[PDB]
Every structure is written in structure tokens, then in C-alpha cells.
């Protein structure tokens, strides 16, 4: 198999500024007939890969003029002259000189903005949920940049493990921020056994970790 | 235009086979190879194999050899891909792709819209909706949509009237095999005594429509 190595893996770009994504192959993708078999495509969530640049340098129909591709037989580049929120997504290079087709690691393009601390909130489980025998405790982190944030859970001041899941929103088109939700899941039995419930949040924009908490039964 | 059009999303149980179709138009079906790629969540894309429509000859990747079968119908301009012995690692979006070269000239690739294939033993189930009650500037409130299957659920606030401030989170798959998500909205603390906040959860596969009032505890 031909090995593609793509770089960089993450790329924050200020609005208006250009972006360059590199991709190199283990062997030449320039066939002796003259055609370079390397393709660049864009992956947004919940939709088909969009072909941007094909056969090295050719722009696909309906792709904006700011997208351009170049390279030698082994070293390639995707250039975007002015990045915008439309361009946010996961970029891939791929080779089709030989089957199996092989793909680069991927480049996650996002808009860059000033640092913004998350607004943290916590929510206890409802009465309606407790009578079914389960207790979910939610910790919302709202409108923050960059995406890297850490959420730790504490029950009677004791750190929790393996009993929580989180998911993160896409980057917002308008304010260029992220939001994350984490959920601490427990049985009704274990929930009633403890009193103090707290999520501790870590993020660049905060000087030291913020805590929000509640006591069971108020 | 060149158009590749795939069949609907599939829920199968471990060990069942899935047969995806790929109907084509706008070009001579015989002239180009139909390649099949997939992308699993949390994984980079992966080439499964290829079929030549005219000859019927197929090439498969080593890892798929012995469990994938690709066929075609010339009359209906359709390519198929039957994968067998499904396990959770085969859960992915499966894409049929038109190849580049036809003998005379080499052009771009054209991709199908994708087909989601979910490998799971879970049965259809409606969610139970629970309020995320606002606390005693800016306040946050929400709805927790718990224990449903399959995806998706749609959430709206005050029947679409409230859109500003809304974050509907991606679902997470729990150990029980069922999905769960939360929808939240930030609002002014001034409005909590007066304004009514309802979330409208719809889950079509179980015919579930719920309207849950989220008020201060």
C-alpha cells in the first residue's frame, strides 16, 4: 500500500488569513503518462465528502477560486487563500495511483478567535427521573474557545471514573465557540447515598479551575 | 450530472449480512470502475474494494477478502456490495465511488451520498424526556433525552420560536446500547418567573412526540 502522510493535523485560522495543508507520499504519484493521482476533499459532519482538487491541481466544478492545489510527484499542498466558517471541517488527501486507495491522517480546520472562558452550569436529576430508578447529573460548559477543556466529577469530594460520557458541539458559525455537555450516570440507590455533587472545569481562559456544585435535597 | 445514489440507512444485528445498492446516471456505466469506501466514526476512511462493470472482475482489500461480495446489474446501471459477518467495528458510513479513468481519458471521482450501517442488537425505543431545571445575567436550562433507539431525535424550543442560544448536543451511545442526548438554551435570568420554556422532542421511529415544560424547581 502507498503511505500518505498529511500535516498539520489541527489548523486554527483567523478569518481572512490563508491556510496551507501539506501531504507527502511514500512513492511518486506522477504516472509516466503525466497525470498526478492525488486528490483533496472536504468532510463536513453528516454529509458526503466534497471533492476540492483532483489530479494534483485541477479545481472541481462549483468550488471557490480561493481553493488551489499544487505539488511535485511526492510532495503536495492544498492552499486556501481566505478561510471562512464555510471552510471549517475535516480535510483529507488521498492517492489513486494504486489500489488500495490510501488517505492522509486528516486536517481539522477551525476558525481562530480570542480565548473565551466557558460559562459553567450544573443540573441535578429530576424527580421524574429518580422514580424510574436512575439518576443523571449534567454539567454544561457554554461558549468557549479553544475546544480543549477538561471536566472532572466529584461525589462527596471523591473523584469519579468511568461513570460519565461527554459530547461537544460543532464550532458555532457566528461566535466561533464550542459547547460541551458531560453526564454523570448513577443508580437511584447510589445517588441517595451521597450529598455533595460537583463538576470541576479546566480550560485556558480560566485562571484556576471553576467549580459548580449542589447538595442533594437542597 | 454524474450521480451515484445509494439505498437507505441500515440497522443489522451482529453476524447478519448487509446489502447496499448504488444506482448511477449521467455517464456510460460500463466505462468506469465502481469503488467502495467506508468511514467508521472515530476512524480514517478505508478502501474496501472495486468492481469493473463490463468484465464483472473484482478486487478486494486483504482484510475484506472472504466476507465482502460486489456485484452489478448492467440493465439497471446498479452496483451492489454485500458485506457479511458484521461486528461493531463494521459500523460506518459506506460510500460507492466512481473511478477516475475510462481507457481514453482520466477525470475526477464522483461519490455517492453515503449509507449509514449500524451494527447493534438493540430494539426500537422512544426516549424519556427529563427537564434540566434552571438554578436560583444569564441562566441555562435544558432537556435530557434518554434511552432511545435508533438515531435521530430532533429537539426544538417553544415550537421553533426560540432559536437564539440553543445547543442541541450530539448523542452518546451508552453501554445498554441505547442513545442519549441533551438540548440546552441560555436565556436571561430576568425572564424565568414570566416566560414559558418548552422543548419539543420528536423521535419518528417510535412515533414519539413529547412537549416538556422546563420551569424553576
Amino acid at each position: 500500500d502507498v503511505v500518505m502522510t498529511q500535516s498539520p493535523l489541527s489548523l486554527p485560522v483567523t478569518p481572512g488569513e490563508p491556510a496551507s495543508i501539506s501531504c507527502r507520499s511514500s512513492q511518486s504519484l506522477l504516472h509516466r503518462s503525466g497525470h498526478k493521482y492525488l486528490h483533496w476533499y472536504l468532510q463536513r459532519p453528516g454529509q458526503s465528502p466534497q471533492v476540492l482538487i483532483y489530479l494534483g491541481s485541477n479545481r472541481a466544478s462549483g468550488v471557490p477560486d480561493r481553493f488551489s492545489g499544487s505539488g511535485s510527484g511526492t510532495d503536495f499542498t492544498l492552499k486556501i487563500s481566505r478561510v471562512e466558517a464555510e471552510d471549517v471541517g475535516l480535510y483529507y488527501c488521498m492517492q489513486t495511483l494504486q489500489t488500495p486507495w490510501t488517505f492522509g491522517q486528516g486536517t481539522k480546520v477551525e476558525i481562530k478567535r480570542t480565548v473565551a472562558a466557558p460559562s459553567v452550569f450544573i443540573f441535578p436529576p429530576s424527580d421524574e427521573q429518580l422514580k424510574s430508578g436512575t439518576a443523571s447529573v449534567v454539567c454544561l460548559l457554554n461558549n468557549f474557545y479553544p475546544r480543549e477543556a477538561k471536566v472532572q466529577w466529584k461525589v462527596d469530594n471523591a473523584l469519579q471514573s468511568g461513570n460519565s460520557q461527554e459530547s461537544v458541539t460543532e464550532q458555532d458559525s457566528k461566535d466561533s465557540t464550542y459547547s460541551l455537555s458531560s453526564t454523570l450516570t448513577l443508580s437511584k440507590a447510589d445517588y441517595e447515598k451521597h450529598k455533595v455533587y460537583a463538576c470541576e472545569v479546566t480550560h485556558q481562559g480560566l485562571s484556576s479551575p471553576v467549580t459548580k456544585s449542589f447538595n442533594r435535597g437542597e | 450530472q454524474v450521480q451515484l445514489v445509494q439505498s437507505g440507512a441500515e440497522v443489522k444485528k451482529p453476524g447478519a449480512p448487509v446489502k447496499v445498492s448504488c444506482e448511477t446516471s449521467g455517464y456510460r456505466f460500463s466505462d468506469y470502475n465502481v469503488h467502495w469506501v467506508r468511514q467508521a466514526p472515530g476512524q480514517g476512511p478505508e478502501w474496501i474494494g472495486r468492481i469493473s462493470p463490463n468484465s464483472g472482475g473484482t478486487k478486494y482489500a486483504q482484510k475484506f477478502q472472504g466476507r465482502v461480495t460486489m456485484t452489478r446489474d448492467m440493465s439497471m446501471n446498479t452496483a451492489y456490495m454485500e458485506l457479511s459477518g458484521l461486528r461493531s467495528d463494521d459500523t460506518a458510513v459506506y460510500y460507492c465511488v466512481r473511478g477516475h479513468c475510462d481507457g481514453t481519458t482520466c477525470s475526477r471521482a464522483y461519490w455517492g451520498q453515503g449509507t449509514l450501517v449500524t451494527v447493534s442488537s438493540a430494539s426500537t425505543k422512544g426516549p424519556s424526556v427529563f427537564p434540566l431545571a434552571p438554578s436560583s445575567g444569564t441562566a441555562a436550562l435544558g432537556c435530557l433525552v434518554k434511552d432511545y433507539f435508533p438515531e435521530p431525535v430532533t429537539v426544538s424550543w417553544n415550537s421553533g420560536a426560540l432559536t437564539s442560544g440553543v445547543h442541541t448536543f450530539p448523542a452518546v451511545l451508552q453501554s445498554s446500547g441505547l442513545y442519549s442526548l441533551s438540548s440546552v438554551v441560555t436565556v436571561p435570568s430576568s425572564s424565568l418567573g414570566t416566560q414559558t420554556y418548552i422543548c419539543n422532542v420528536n423521535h419518528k421511529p417510535s412515533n414519539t412526540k413529547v412537549d416538556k415544560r422546563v420551569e424553576p424547581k
Binding site: 503518462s33 493521482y37 489500489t99 | 468506469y32 472482475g57 473484482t58 477516475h100 479513468c101 475510462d102
Partner: peptide, 10 residues
């Protein structure tokens, strides 16, 4: 069939 499509014109 083990012939990749970039080798069709040969």
C-alpha cells in the same frame, strides 16, 4: 482482474 485504472491507456 488486477489492473488499476491509471494503467488502462497502458
Amino acid at each position: 482482474d488486477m489492473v488499476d485504472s491509471p494503467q488502462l491507456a497502458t
